[PDB]
Amino acid sequence: LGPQVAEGENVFGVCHIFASFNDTFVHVTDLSGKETICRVTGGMKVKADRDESSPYAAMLAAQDVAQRCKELGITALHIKLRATGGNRTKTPGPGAQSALRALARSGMKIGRIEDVTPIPSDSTRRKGGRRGRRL
RNA sequence: GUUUUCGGAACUGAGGCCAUGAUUAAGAGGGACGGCCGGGGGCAUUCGUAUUGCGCCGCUAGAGGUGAAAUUCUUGGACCGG
Secondary structure (H helix, E strand, O other): OOOOOOOOOOOEEEEEEEEOOOOEEEEEEOOOOOOEEEEEEHHHOOOOOHHHHOHHHHHHHHHHHHHHHHHOOOOEEEEEEEOOOOOOOOOOOOHHHHHHHHHHHOOOEEEEEEEOOOOOOOOOOOOOOOOOOOO
16 A cells, blocks of 8 residues: 555655645645645635635645545655746745645654746747736 | 350250258157967857756655646656756
């Protein structure tokens, strides 16, 4: 079922935290990244558009993710936090910090923390006009 | 008839005092030369992520978008991860 090898050591996964300003993704996956353990977003925890990116929704999603990973044998997590990136914003959304803190607070062990938002060497045009969005 | 040069007219064969004759080198300009310098220009040639598609590998059935006023796919698997 799970790795019951060397109970005294850590089993490491990778948590890809995608914190956009619309909602937040808490995605724990294999060490290589190909196999996924569980992905719980903030939108499957709140029934309203606005709170999809809220810190509370991210805390709930991270709690469920950590519960599933603990019941699946994974004990420690490497963090790969990303914002939307591209030509859009590079600042992580409101739920990133709360998701990370909820992962740490719910009995998970944190490994290396890395920021992986996609940064262009230079990009295509942004979705706004030349005068920007005026609201 | 014929009076060659002393107040003129052409073919110019020789030589000499010419103090023999070219201002300077613009805190003007042009040009040359020297070592550089610059996202200056043209041609060719490399590289970088990002974005968008496409093919594979893993699910709740959600993601997008705006302070909750919607359009936008779906046991045809979106978003996400590789």
